[PDB]
Amino acid sequence: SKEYHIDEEVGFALPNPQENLPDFYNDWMFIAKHLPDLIESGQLRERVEKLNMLSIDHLTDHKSQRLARLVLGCITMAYVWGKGHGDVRKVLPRNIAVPYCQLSKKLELPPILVYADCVLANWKKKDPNKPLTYENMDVLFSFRDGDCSKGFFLVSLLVEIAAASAIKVIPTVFKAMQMQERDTLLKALLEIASCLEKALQVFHQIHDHVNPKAFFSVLRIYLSGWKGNPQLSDGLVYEGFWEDPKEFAGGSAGQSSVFQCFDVLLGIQQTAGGGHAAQFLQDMRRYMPPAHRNFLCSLESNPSVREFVLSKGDAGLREAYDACVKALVSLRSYHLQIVTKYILIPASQQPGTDLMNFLKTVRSTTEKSLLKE
Numbered sequence: 244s245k246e247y248h249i250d251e252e253v254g255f256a257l258p259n260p261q262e263n264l265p266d267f268y269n270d271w272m273f274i275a276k277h278l279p280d281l282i283e284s285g286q287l288r289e290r291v292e293k294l295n296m297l298s299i300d301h302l303t304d305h306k307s308q309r310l311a312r313l314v315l316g317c318i319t320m321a322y323v324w325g326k327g328h329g330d331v332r333k334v335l336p337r338n339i340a341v342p343y344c345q346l347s348k349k350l351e352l353p354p355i356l357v358y359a360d361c362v363l364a365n366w367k368k369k370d371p372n373k374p375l376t377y378e379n380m381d382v383l384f385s386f387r388d389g390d391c392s393k394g395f396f397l398v399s400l401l402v403e404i405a406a407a408s409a410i411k412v413i414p415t416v417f418k419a420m421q422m423q424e425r426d427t428l429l430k431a432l433l434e435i436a437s438c439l440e441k442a443l444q445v446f447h448q449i450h451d452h453v454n455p456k457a458f459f460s461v462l463r464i465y466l467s468g469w470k471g472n473p474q475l476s477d478g479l480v481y482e483g484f485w486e487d488p489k490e491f492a493g494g495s496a497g498q499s500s501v502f503q504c505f506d507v508l509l510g511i512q513q514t515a516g517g518g519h520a521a522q523f524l525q526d527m528r529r530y531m532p533p534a535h536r537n538f539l540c541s542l543e544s545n546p547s548v549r550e551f552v553l554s555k556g557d558a559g560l561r562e563a564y565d566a567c568v569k570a571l572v573s574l575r576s577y578h579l580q581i582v583t584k585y586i587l588i589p590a591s592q593q594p595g596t597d598l599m600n601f602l603k604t605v606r607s608t609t610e611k612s613l614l615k616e
């Protein structure tokens with residue numbers, strides 16, 4: 244609905260995100276729109292240290308505040324990590340930290356770039372009247388020339404949107420179980436499965452638009468956060484807003500709601516067990532927008548789709564449920580292959596990880612939810 248901020252077209256993504264802020268914030272937008280020249284020239288940190296402190300009161304609707312969070316989030320990554328060679332700032336200047344933490348407290352999100360900023364809200368259509376294909380789309384902000392962030396954010400964004408074609412179906416599922424309508428529940432479970440088989444096809448495009456070397460050595464440096472990071476073992480200091488330094492995880496698709504939400508639906512208990520995999524994904528729910536957090540809890544509160552299918556001794560229904568579970572395993576087995584190509588191999592050309600065993604624990608938990616192998 245509209246109380247969960249889910250769009251019929253783009254799902255958990257933000258529809259037609261604002262690209263422009265009020266005139267009153269050009270000093271923010273000037274830095275955010277030129278990070279590649281500013282970082283590379285050495286001017287970025289000084290142009291943020293000079294910056295006046297600006298109030299947030301003039302960010303009037305949601306899309307304004309979201310673009311602002313993206314501006315401020317990307318500026319911060321570039322400040323903290325600099326040129327991404329290892330000189331890290333450990334203090335973020337009050338003149339930018341303070342409005343960032345205040346706009347963050349307002350949207351119930353952490354003051355750091357999250358998946359909802361740099362993917363869900365970091366896109367435009369080139370042509371309003373062409374479709375959401377990679378070739379009529381662009382991102383608003385990047386960090387460096389050759390960081391391959393268009394290719395990465397937008398392919399991520401596109402697989403998000405592909406899987407959102409199945410969100411439409413979720414209420415149908417829950418009504419069908421409560422109204423005891425076996426035929427339309429089976430039909431919903433197979434449509435969902437069709438949607439997740441589709442979204443795998445979309446994923447194939449990563450190979451055309453993201454190069455392994457550029458991805459491993461550049462974009463990865465800027466998305467890193469500061470929770471368990473040796474390089475900021477104690478966190479970032481939000482000057483004038485906090486106390487002592489504060490730890491906050493970097494962006495990840497662990498912060499994506501579509502994939503967490505199909506696990507919950509199908510009764511795949513990714514967040515159970517007290518393991519590290521389950522803790523990370525539970526923790527990452529706090530970097531989701533609150534309406535989406537709240538929608539994952541609506542799901543967790545309905546009756547188990549999975550118990551309902553086991554209890555009915557109904558083979559077509561067990562097969563449709565498995566089509567779903569099998570489509571998630573497909574996505575994740577493919578995704579493991581892309582980690583192999585885009586992290587593991589590039590890292591092996593540097594004068595398994597953890598990672599990898601993380602992802603294969605999530606793959607394993609999915610696979611083990613099949614009713615019949």
Ligand code: HEM
Pocket residue numbers: 398399400402403446449453458494495496497499502575578581582585586598601602605
């Ligand atoms: C559209 C493309 C992508 C999607 C849908 C996606 C989705 C996800 C999801 C849902 C997770 C959480 C674990 C899970 O649920 O499986 C995850 C974790 C991860 N993904 Fe991806 N991802 C994408 C692109 C990439 C690329 C290109 C790479 C590597 C080059 C990558 C590397 C990772 C890594 C390293 C993790 C685990 C550690 C972390 O959170 O960063 N992903 N991804």
Ligand SMILES: O[C@@H]1CCCC[C@H]1CNc1cc(Br)cc2[nH]ncc12
Pocket residue numbers: 357358361362399462463466494495496497
């Ligand atoms: O540790 C990894 C190193 C490689 C890239 C970034 C980080 C993980 N961060 C991510 C961020 C976004 Br935005 C989308 C994603 N999709 N999959 C991972 C992932």
